């Protein structure tokens, strides 16, 4: 009793959109992101921290799956500006364990067991004041992801318009959290302020989200997840899809041009985040098959 297969996939458009994304970055960012190459002992300080954090929750996560989560941090920070490798490791761990939370059936969502682990992490890696800002944002993200599961507010914000949708994603895609745990990496006063006002997150939300949405569309509709801007257009209609996609390209371009008004080091961090997320997204098994050993729901 067939449903709407023609709306089930953006796979027809995969090559052309990938090409167009890359052309856009080449014309407006130019500088290619840089990957951090951790060592193995060093990677096992991150991963055993990740396993320790989610271990109380009772679900095993493979090293392969951790790898899929951690790549976004390796590719989308600004390695040239790092001064707190402890803060960098915190962001690797915090990113990864909240990625697990994102992928979990909400039955496993135990704040009483998981929150204490998040405080544990922020304390090993951050000075006591930055540990406070990182913990607040991690708490706020995991609480948001959880209460908004099948939520009326999410329904309305994901159906009305792109600008309502992106307003939801400032928090839900995790970028506000990202900024508020990453500023200790850089010890840059201006970026720290843009991080704490959330202006940093507001400038980078669309560039992160549009890319994530395109490449996670197939998995998300097969699972009934509504948080994806391409559900706002008719992806079965090539003409309509193209107009929508160009509108989203225009969004990214305008944000990138305004990020250029920020000071030199802040804009490097912002642009490495957006462009690094795109390199990571296109290179990661997470977004290559619909359902896999690193991206299928962790069900309970």
Q: How far is the CB of 270 from a copy of itself (least distance, A)?
A: 11
Site size toward a copy of itself, by CB under 8 A:
34
Piece of the chain touching K ion by CB under 5 A; list 60-68, 85-93, 212-220, 251-259: 251-259
**Mask for 156-195, x = binds a copy of itself (CB under 8 A):** xx--xx-xx--xx-xx----x-------------x--x--
Q: Which residues bind to ligand EXW, rule: CB under 6 A?
A: 72, 76, 94-95, 98-99, 102, 141, 173-175, 177-178, 208, 212, 277
DSSP assignments along the chain, one per residue? ----GGGS--GGGHHHHHHHHHHHHHHHT-SPP------HHHHHHHHHHHHHHHGGGT----HHHHHHHHHHHHHHS-GGG---HHHHHHHHHHHHHHHHHHHB-GGG--HHHHHHHHHHHHHHHS-HHHHHHHHHHHHHHHHHHHHTTT-HHHHHHHHS-HHHHHHHHHHHTSHHHHHHHHHHHH--HHHHHHHHHSHHHHHHHHHHHHHHHHHHHHHHHHHT----GGGGS-TTSHHHHHHHHHHHHHHHHHHHHHHTTS-HHHHHHHHHHHHHHHHHHHT-GGGTSSS-TTTS-B--
| Residue 236 interaction partner, one of Mg ion, K ion, ligand EXW, none, beta carbon < 5-8 Å per kind | Mg ion
Residue 255 touches K ion, criterion: CB under 5 A: no
Chain residues 73-132 in contact with Cl ion, contact rule CB under 5 A: 127, 129-130
Query: Could you tell me which residues are annotated as the binding site?
Result: 102, 212, 216, 220
Report the site for a copy of itself in 125-144 (rule: CB under 8 A): 136, 140, 143-144
Q: How many residues bind Cl ion (CB under 5 A)?
A: 5
Among 8, 22, 198, 296, binds Cl ion (CB under 5 A): 198
Q: Which of 25, 186, 262, 280 binds a copy of itself (CB under 8 A)?
A: 262
Q: Which residues bind Mg ion (CB under 5 A)?
A: 7, 102, 123, 126, 131, 212, 216, 236, 293
């Amino acid at each position: 009793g067939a449903q709407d297969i023609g709306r089930s996939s953006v796979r027809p458009y995969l090559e052309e959109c990938t090409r167009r994304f890359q052309e856009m970055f080449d014309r407006h960012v130019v500088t290619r992101p840089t990957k951090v190459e951790l060592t193995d002992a060093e990677l096992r300080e991150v991963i055993d921290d990740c396993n320790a954090a989610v271990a109380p929750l009772g679900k095993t996560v493979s090293d392969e799956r951790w790898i899929s989560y951690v790549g976004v941090v390796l590719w989308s920070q600004s390695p040239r500006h790092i001064k707190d490798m402890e803060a960098f490791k915190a962001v690797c761990v915090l990113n990864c364990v909240t990625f697990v939370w994102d992928d979990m059936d909400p039955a496993l969502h135990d704040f009483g067991l998981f929150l204490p682990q998040l405080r544990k992490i922020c304390e090993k890696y951050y000075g006591p004041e930055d540990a406070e800002v990182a913990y607040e944002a991690a708490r706020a993200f995991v609480t948001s992801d959880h209460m908004f599961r099948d939520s009326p507010i999410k329904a309305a914000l994901c159906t009305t318009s792109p600008e309502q949708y992106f307003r939801f994603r400032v928090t839900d895609i995790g970028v506000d959290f990202w900024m508020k745990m990453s500023y200790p990496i850089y010890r840059h006063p201006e970026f720290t302020e843009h991080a704490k006002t959330s202006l940093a997150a507001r400038m980078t939300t669309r560039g992160l989200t549009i890319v994530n949405d395109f490449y996670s569309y197939d998995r998300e509709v097969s699972l009934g997840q509504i948080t994806n801007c391409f559900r706002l257009c008719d992806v079965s209609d090539e003409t309509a899809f193209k107009e929508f996609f160009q509108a989203r390209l225009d969004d990214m371009i305008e944000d990138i041009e305004c990020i250029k008004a920020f000071d030199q080091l802040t804009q490097d961090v912002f642009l490495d985040l957006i462009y690094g997320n795109f390199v990571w997204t296109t290179s990661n098994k997470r977004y290559k098959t619909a359902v896999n050993d690193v991206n299928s729901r962790i069900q309970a």
